[PDB]
Amino acid sequence: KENPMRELRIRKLCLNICVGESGDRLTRAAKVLEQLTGQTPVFSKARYTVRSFGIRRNEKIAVHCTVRGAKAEEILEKGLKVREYELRKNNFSDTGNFGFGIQEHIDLGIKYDPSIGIYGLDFYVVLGRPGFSIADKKRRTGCIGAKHRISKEEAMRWFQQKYDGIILPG
Amino acid sequence: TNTKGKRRGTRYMFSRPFRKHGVVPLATYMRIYKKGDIVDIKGMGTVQKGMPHKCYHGKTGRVYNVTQHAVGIVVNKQVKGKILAKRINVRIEHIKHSKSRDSFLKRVKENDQKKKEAKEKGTWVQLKRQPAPPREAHFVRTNGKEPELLEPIPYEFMA
Amino acid sequence: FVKVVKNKAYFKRYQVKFRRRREGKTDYYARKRLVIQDKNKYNTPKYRMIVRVTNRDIICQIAYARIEGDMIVCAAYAHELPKYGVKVGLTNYAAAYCTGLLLARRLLNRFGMDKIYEGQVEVTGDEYNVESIDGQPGAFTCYLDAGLARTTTGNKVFGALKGAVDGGLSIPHSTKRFPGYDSESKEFNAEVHRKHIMGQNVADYMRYLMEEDEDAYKKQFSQYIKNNVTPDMMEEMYKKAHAAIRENPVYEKKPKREVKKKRWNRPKMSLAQKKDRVAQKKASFLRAQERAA
RNA sequence: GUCUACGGCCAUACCACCCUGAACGCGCCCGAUCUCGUCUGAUCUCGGAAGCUAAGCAGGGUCGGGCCUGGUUAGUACUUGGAUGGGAGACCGCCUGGGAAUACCGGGUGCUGUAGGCU
RNA sequence: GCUCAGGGAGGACAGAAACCUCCCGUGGAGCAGAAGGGCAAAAGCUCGCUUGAUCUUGAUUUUCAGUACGAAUACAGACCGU
């Protein structure tokens, strides 16, 4: 049968917000994550000056927050409640860790304030399995095993068996 | 004329060998050397401080002083003027070995052992290296087969 | 499509590193700077003390550099403590201190310096350097070798180091990476360090879990309840363990069991067997294709 | 026969696939209550064993690749010294010593010092 | 404490290009400059505080007539930094 040391589970949920604007929009996007999670998120800066987008070197644009624990499960439950248990083929990656972006945050359940504005985000679900400390530990790093790797078809059939969500083609 | 320089024309001399880049073994570092040992110099690319000059590659010398990092050696430089037994300071990495002195010491020890041996017998022992003589006459055996009469081959065009 | 990364030119020109470097255990850049030795010392054996941290055992070896290999002259382990009578507290600061003190007293008893440098019996935590007492010759000294571990404020490696210093191994160190030392206010607190030595912070939280809930307490200490040692017994247990260290520091080797002499390894396959395998495959494939088609 | 820790020589040791593993032994893992630094025990550190050899690790094959080593290439290319040697030049041979590198085809997939254990 | 050039799979605004992690990655990036050698738990990247770019005597090397000048080498003695 199946070993209980091979039970697939969710590791984390990446939640990035890139509005493409610095100043007021950035802090009003950070206040949404402050009201949702209740912790300080990690900002990010630009690469170089581009005249097309209108950004310069060393200027904060986007902000992310890797949510772990039961809070990531509750925010992913909000995301499934918004997306009514359906996904697409292009949202799944070939490795297995998969993301999908939303437009507005009023469908989650958060009350909309007129001064803040609409801020959506990407639910980048990172799944896992017991035994991924050798991949990032201090002593040794190496391969973890071909049967231990998680595949795209296995992740899709696990999602369909567990969460009962259909996967439409296209 | 020509350009003066310490590291000039040393693209292949002080460069690292094939598949010997980066990781340096720890054999030469932890071992020691006594005073007055036969040491010849081979260059190295990973060492930047205390390098030998490009005109001291493959020169045999002996150690006169032993410091912590850079030990001294009396190398026999043959400059255009004359031969000088000069003193330079080279770090541990540019130090090789030589089995000729070891074989010479083992040969002297074996000759002393054979000299102490058979003293009560009183027999003469060939100690010196007698050079290669011509061969001794011997009988060439043959049976059954005969030497084949070989003949040359005609010319054919190569290309 | 894209170009294949694993090319045959890359297989030919790919240089491999050392075996321990590929395994990722030996740090050569730090190890060389630890094993530096002056060339005017003329074969002076540099002794060093190596700490390794397993999940349960604490390995404390003593090595010295040789050209064939650094031979281990002595080694202390934590699983030999129930032989002396240490049932509970297998891997903590007190077990690391007792392992270091036992290794130090065994080392001085093997070199023959047991009566000189009796050591700190009543452990307090105050600093006491190892100074050379005249009359007797020079005492043993060595150097520290922590390994692949970040030395933060408070560690069992520094506890074994303090045990070796109290036993009589003069190793130079500072009082910064010790437990009880505050990071901001920066004062070494001997009374707080005595709490880390004796283990009041463990026993108070054991009493707190005993007041709170039994399930998490049993899950945290499953066989520690089975060994039946109260937290009031925890303070006197290490006091008896110190006397057990002072009684018999030397260790006697185990009698080995007779080997049944069987090869558990799979034997190496020869050229004739490999040729027979590929010949049976090439003979079976053609007749199977003829039988199927 | 075999494991762990400390190691030397550094691909016969390297990358992938497949199969099997009694005992010791190394690890997966549960949490943050303290020292510890981070959004978060994700990293380090600390407190431990509910479970497991699944993964990790050990061993062996791939008409596997790479690597090491012999034949082949081949007395072939080249090269020290010499000549009323030739040839209009270009270039080549002789006396004499030495002596290659590919492509291609055969064999193999680590030795190993000390300490601590299993049988 | 970590790893870069460059590339694969994607995501409402967002495309060839703003941001994120999943998979590798002998160096094809970077190490101040033209160039050469060399560099992967580093000599690249980021951090804590520092100034050994401190002082006093020699010997030796590179061109050299074994003559200067500049540069470099570990030694002799104290004193600082993490």
Curated annotation (Swiss-Prot), chain A:
<dbReference type="GO" id="GO:0005737">
    <property type="term" value="C:cytoplasm"/>
</dbReference>
<keyword id="KW-0963">Cytoplasm</keyword>
<comment type="similarity">
    <text>Belongs to the universal ribosomal protein uL5 family.</text>
</comment>
<comment type="subunit">
    <text>Component of the large ribosomal subunit (LSU). Part of the 5S RNP complex, which is a LSU subcomplex composed of the 5S RNA, RPL5 and RPL11. Component of a hexameric 5S RNP precursor complex, composed of 5S RNA, RRS1, RPF2/BXDC1, RPL5, RPL11 and HEATR3; this complex acts as a precursor for ribosome assembly. Interacts with PML. Interacts with MDM2 (via its RanBP2-type zinc finger domain); negatively regulates MDM2-mediated TP53 ubiquitination and degradation. Interacts with NOP53; retains RPL11 into the nucleolus.</text>
</comment>
<dbReference type="InterPro" id="IPR031309">
    <property type="entry name" value="Ribosomal_uL5_C"/>
</dbReference>
<keyword id="KW-0007">Acetylation</keyword>
<feature type="modified residue" description="N6-acetyllysine; alternate">
    <location>
        <position position="45"/>
    </location>
</feature>
<keyword id="KW-0539">Nucleus</keyword>
<dbReference type="Pfam" id="PF00673">
    <property type="entry name" value="Ribosomal_L5_C"/>
</dbReference>
<dbReference type="GO" id="GO:0019843">
    <property type="term" value="F:rRNA binding"/>
</dbReference>
<dbReference type="GO" id="GO:0005840">
    <property type="term" value="C:ribosome"/>
</dbReference>
<dbReference type="GO" id="GO:0005730">
    <property type="term" value="C:nucleolus"/>
</dbReference>
<protein>
    <recommendedName>
        <fullName>Large ribosomal subunit protein uL5</fullName>
    </recommendedName>
</protein>
<comment type="function">
    <text>Component of the ribosome, a large ribonucleoprotein complex responsible for the synthesis of proteins in the cell. The small ribosomal subunit (SSU) binds messenger RNAs (mRNAs) and translates the encoded message by selecting cognate aminoacyl-transfer RNA (tRNA) molecules. The large subunit (LSU) contains the ribosomal catalytic site termed the peptidyl transferase center (PTC), which catalyzes the formation of peptide bonds, thereby polymerizing the amino acids delivered by tRNAs into a polypeptide chain.</text>
</comment>
<dbReference type="InterPro" id="IPR002132">
    <property type="entry name" value="Ribosomal_uL5"/>
</dbReference>
From Swiss-Prot, chain B:
<dbReference type="GO" id="GO:0005840">
    <property type="term" value="C:ribosome"/>
</dbReference>
<feature type="region of interest" description="Disordered">
    <location>
        <begin position="111"/>
        <end position="144"/>
    </location>
</feature>
<protein>
    <recommendedName>
        <fullName>Large ribosomal subunit protein eL21</fullName>
    </recommendedName>
</protein>
<feature type="compositionally biased region" description="Basic and acidic residues">
    <location>
        <begin position="111"/>
        <end position="122"/>
    </location>
</feature>
<dbReference type="InterPro" id="IPR036948">
    <property type="entry name" value="Ribosomal_eL21_sf"/>
</dbReference>
<feature type="compositionally biased region" description="Basic and acidic residues">
    <location>
        <begin position="135"/>
        <end position="144"/>
    </location>
</feature>
<dbReference type="GO" id="GO:0005783">
    <property type="term" value="C:endoplasmic reticulum"/>
</dbReference>
<dbReference type="GO" id="GO:0006412">
    <property type="term" value="P:translation"/>
</dbReference>
<comment type="function">
    <text>Component of the large ribosomal subunit. The ribosome is a large ribonucleoprotein complex responsible for the synthesis of proteins in the cell.</text>
</comment>
<dbReference type="GO" id="GO:0005829">
    <property type="term" value="C:cytosol"/>
</dbReference>
<dbReference type="InterPro" id="IPR001147">
    <property type="entry name" value="Ribosomal_eL21"/>
</dbReference>
<keyword id="KW-0256">Endoplasmic reticulum</keyword>
<dbReference type="Pfam" id="PF01157">
    <property type="entry name" value="Ribosomal_L21e"/>
</dbReference>
<dbReference type="InterPro" id="IPR008991">
    <property type="entry name" value="Translation_prot_SH3-like_sf"/>
</dbReference>
<keyword id="KW-0687">Ribonucleoprotein</keyword>
UniProtKB/Swiss-Prot annotation, chain C:
<dbReference type="GO" id="GO:0022625">
    <property type="term" value="C:cytosolic large ribosomal subunit"/>
</dbReference>
<feature type="modified residue" description="Phosphothreonine">
    <location>
        <position position="230"/>
    </location>
</feature>
<keyword id="KW-0597">Phosphoprotein</keyword>
<keyword id="KW-0539">Nucleus</keyword>
<feature type="modified residue" description="N6-acetyllysine; alternate">
    <location>
        <position position="218"/>
    </location>
</feature>
<dbReference type="Pfam" id="PF17144">
    <property type="entry name" value="Ribosomal_L5e"/>
</dbReference>
<dbReference type="Pfam" id="PF14204">
    <property type="entry name" value="Ribosomal_L18_c"/>
</dbReference>
<feature type="modified residue" description="N6-acetyllysine">
    <location>
        <position position="46"/>
    </location>
</feature>
<keyword id="KW-0832">Ubl conjugation</keyword>
<keyword id="KW-0699">rRNA-binding</keyword>
<feature type="cross-link" description="Glycyl lysine isopeptide (Lys-Gly) (interchain with G-Cter in SUMO1); alternate">
    <location>
        <position position="218"/>
    </location>
</feature>
<keyword id="KW-0007">Acetylation</keyword>
<keyword id="KW-0694">RNA-binding</keyword>
<dbReference type="GO" id="GO:0003735">
    <property type="term" value="F:structural constituent of ribosome"/>
</dbReference>
<dbReference type="GO" id="GO:0005737">
    <property type="term" value="C:cytoplasm"/>
</dbReference>
